[PDB]
Design a protein around this ligand. Structure first.
Ligand SMILES: Cc1cc2nc3c(=O)[nH]c(=O)nc-3n(C[C@H](O)[C@H](O)[C@H](O)COP(=O)(O)O)c2cc1C
Ligand SMILES: [Cl-]
Ligand SMILES: [Cl-]
Ligand SMILES: [Mg+2]
Length: 436
């Protein structure tokens, strides 16, 4: 299936069955855990736990499942041979359009230790992006199934029109079956199961109206046949417009990632949506920003791209430019109204990223554009914490000049000074001590 395409550790469970068993285990999961598929299907995932597993952590999982909400935790699990591993584990419910839970998705990122700060952030976003793709792949597989069913009915409507000597109605049906196939292929490209579902339902309508045209024809009703056919033509036109809009978006994302300036321009001139996004919320501006495509950045902003577009993990183009160390892109996004304080789902601002990645001139520019020097992530860490932990003496100095709080304490009651001492960064400890 599409889920057999995803090469990550995950399982899907069925909460409608007694004790919420695993109904799907990716081969990565089987490879991680040293169990066979036969050993795993029909089992509750708690068999991964063992002596060292933190029972309060497991109670967090229990409460999140019982409240039908998502949760992310880190907890010790065990292979079949009894090998300990750390598991960054993300849970989220897979719901119907009615908003009613049907499965649970569970993604495991295996490691040797408990992660904190920036490594914790990286793991959390990875597994959150895996879960979202598993959701989309499942919603796509279901939408595509229904659409191939409509496509088969359109083919029988084509055969019926031909049998009845209506090649115009037969030709409309054939066009309609091609448009649905087109929709399926573009929707996989951009991760948009809503496009498939919308196009399948419109194709179904055009099929019903062709059949209404055939019945009008057998009764000799000229006016009814012509009106049914005109409506069929405008439904096919509407389907072709939908597919074209989705195809321009797929092409504009691809042009931005490739760095094709003239192609970006051409596609925007044809009416490509500057704010079109893949299933994960990535925009052309995200791809240009992260790859240092300054001209493409300026073109997109001029053509109405949202400088502050957030993907599914709250990541903005300013974040991507800041970690990537694209100083001129950072300058241009800020010049065009980028929110200097945008926080992702982990609480990281662009300044957190600049500080962790050791981009001193980017830290300077963010600060000079009004960045909150004391912004705290979900672990209570400020940029000064990150600069002190990672040995960035000059960034430490710049943060202090721009008002960084020497006394700010993270989740663990640690100040930047404490992290400097804990990490051997005695020169930094001295600057922080003098500043206090
Ligand atoms: C989709 C999904 C995946 C899960 N994956 C894991 C896992 O990788 N590791 C783990 O220790 N528990 C995992 N669990 C949690 C357990 O199955 C169970 O919910 C947890 O132990 C708390 O409930 P309990 O107190 O009844 O055991 C997962 C649960 C679900 C719904
Ligand atoms: Cl860190
Ligand atoms: Cl009609
Ligand atoms: Mg359970």
């Amino acid at each position: 299936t599409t889920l057999e395409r995803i090469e990550k550790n995950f399982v899907i469970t069925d909460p409608r069955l007694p004790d919420n068993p695993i109904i799907f285990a990716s081969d990565s999961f089987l490879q991680l855990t040293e169990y066979s598929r036969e050993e795993i299907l029909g089992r509750n995932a708690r068999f991964l736990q063992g002596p060292e597993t933190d029972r309060a952590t497991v109670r967090k999982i229990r409460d999140a499942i019982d409240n039908q909400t998502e949760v992310t935790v880190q907890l010790i699990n065990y292979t079949k041979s009894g090998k300990k591993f750390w598991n960054v584990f993300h849970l989220q419910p897979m719901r119907d359009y009615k908003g009613d839970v049907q499965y649970f998705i569970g993604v495991q990122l295996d490691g040797t230790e408990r992660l904190h700060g920036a490594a914790e952030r990286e793991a959390v976003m990875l597994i959150k992006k895996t879960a979202a793709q598993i959701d989309a792949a499942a919603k796509l597989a279901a939408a595509i199934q229904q659409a191939k069913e409509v496509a088969k009915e359109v083919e029988k409507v084509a055969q019926r029109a031909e049998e009845e000597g209506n090649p115009d109605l037969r030709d409309s049906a054939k066009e309609l079956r091609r448009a649905v196939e087109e929709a399926i292929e573009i929707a996989k490209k951009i991760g948009n199961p809503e496009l498939v579902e919308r196009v399948a339902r419109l194709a179904k309508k055009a099929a019903e109206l062709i059949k209404r045209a055939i019945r009008a024809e057998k009764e000799g009703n000229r006016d009814e046949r012509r009106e049914a056919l005109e409506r069929v033509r405008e439904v096919i036109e509407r389907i072709e417009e939908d597919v074209r809009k989705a195809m321009l978006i797929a092409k504009l994302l691809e042009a931005a990632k490739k760095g094709q300036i003239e192609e970006v321009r051409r596609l925007l001139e044809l009416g490509a949506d500057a704010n079109g996004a893949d299933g994960g919320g990535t925009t052309p501006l995200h791809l240009a920003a992260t790859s240092g495509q300054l001209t493409i950045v300026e073109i997109l902003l001029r053509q109405g791209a949202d400088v502050n577009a957030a993907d599914n993990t709250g990541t903005t183009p300013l974040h991507l430019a800041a970690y990537s160390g694209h100083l001129e892109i950072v300058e241009v996004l800020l010049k065009h109204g980028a929110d200097v304080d945008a926080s992702d789902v982990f609480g990281y601002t662009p300044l957190h990223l600049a500080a962790y990645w050791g981009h001193l001139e980017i830290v300077e520019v963010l600060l000079k554009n009004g960045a909150d020097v004391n912004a705290m992530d979900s672990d209570g860490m400020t940029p000064l914490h990150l600069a002190a932990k990672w040995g960035y003496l000059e960034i430490v100095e710049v943060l202090l000049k721009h008002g960084a709080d020497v006394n700010a304490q993270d989740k663990f009651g640690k100040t930047p000074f404490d992290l400097a001492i804990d990490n051997g960064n005695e020169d930094i400890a001295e600057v922080l001590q003098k500043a206090a």
